[PDB]
Design a protein around this ligand. Structure first.
Ligand SMILES: *[C@@H]1O[C@H](CO)[C@@H](O[C@@H]2O[C@H](CO)[C@@H](O)[C@H](O)[C@H]2NC(C)=O)[C@H](O)[C@H]1NC(C)=O
Ligand SMILES: *[C@H]1O[C@H](CO)[C@@H](O)[C@H](O)[C@@H]1O
Length: 278
């Protein structure tokens, strides 16, 4: 609790076709998306907002396997290896909309919370529209990169504040989001709903750093080598045996790589996204 799990890596328990799929659903947030009727894996694109310039694109899909799926783009509205003194990187209390639901002393990174906050009323409205419209009780939140941290917060919000709560969340290249209190609270509200997938030598999962008071929730699955299908699960928070044991590269190569046969290539990858293409 605040610590670093020393536990041994296990086989990857996650459903890889669902990981594959969610990757597709999020790659698509980098493409224009009221291309109406669009189809990605088992999924129908239902709705879209934002555009990746002032807010992240968010796509709402419907999926037989993942329910109503909310995907949050993670383009670089701001930069994660810029000057770690900027207001973007400061910890702050939960927004007043949902502070009532969190332990006391939950801190969340500003850049991520502000960016979720400019989308949260619309997301909620849209998620309710299409739940009612498709008689669907499962809500899946997906994000990549900056969208991954936003997605974590969104997934928490949905669990706490939305009726029916959360089905699952798949989170790719998840930057850190909250303090140890936040990370532990995630473990307990959505621990078993939580899926954090890291590819190769990706650096993003290491920022903002722990020195500033940030802590990942428990477990990720780490795909090494990058773009392969070998993956162990590294359990507990901030597992000493994981990603840091291999040099991080300081570009977005692995970051924008192949996650169980689907490439999340971002602005420069597949549009529309192609589930299973690789
Ligand atoms: C895994 O896949 C990605 C692309 O999906 C590879 O990254 C590319 O690498 C070259 C230089 O290394 C760049 O000029 C490209 O821009 C990269 N593509 C993207 C989309 O970023 C990556 O190197 C592969 N990783 C491994 C370990 O083989
Ligand atoms: C790694 O080592 C720690 C303490 O060093 C144990 O608590 C843990 O369970 C693991 O074996």
């Amino acid at each position: 609790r605040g610590g670093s799990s020393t536990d041994q890596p296990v086989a990857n328990p996650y459903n890889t076709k669902e990981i594959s799929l969610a990757a597709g659903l999020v790659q698509q947030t980098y493409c224009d998306s009221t291309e109406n009727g669009l189809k990605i894996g088992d999924s129908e694109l239902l709705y879209t907002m934002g555009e990746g310039y002032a807010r992240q694109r968010v796509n709402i899909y419907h999926s037989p396997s993942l329910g109503i799926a909310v995907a949050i783009e993670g383009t670089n509205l701001f930069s994660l290896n810029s000057d770690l003194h900027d207001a973007k990187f400061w910890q702050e209390d939960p927004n007043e909309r949902y502070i009532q639901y969190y332990p006391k002393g939950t801190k969340l990174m500003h850049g991520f919370q502000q960016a979720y906050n400019d989308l949260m009323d619309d997301i909620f409205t849209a998620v309710k529209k299409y739940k009612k419209e498709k008689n669907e009780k499962r809500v899946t939140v997906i994000g990549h990169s900056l969208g991954a941290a936003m997605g974590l917060l969104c997934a928490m919000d949905i669990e706490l504040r939305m009726d029916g709560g959360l089905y699952k969340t798949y989170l790719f290249g998840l930057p850190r989001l909250g303090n140890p209190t936040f990370a532990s609270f995630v473990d307990q509200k959505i621990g078993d709903k939580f899926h954090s997938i890291i590819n190769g030598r990706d650096w993003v999962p290491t920022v903002p750093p722990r020195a500033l008071g940030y802590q990942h929730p428990s477990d990720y699955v780490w795909i090494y080598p990058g773009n392969s299908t070998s993956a162990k699960l590294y359990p507990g928070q901030e597992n000493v045996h994981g990603i840091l044991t291999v040099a991080r590269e300081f570009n977005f190569d692995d970051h924008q790589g192949i996650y169980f046969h689907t490439q999340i290539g971002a602005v420069m990858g597949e549009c529309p996204a192609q589930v299973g293409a690789h």
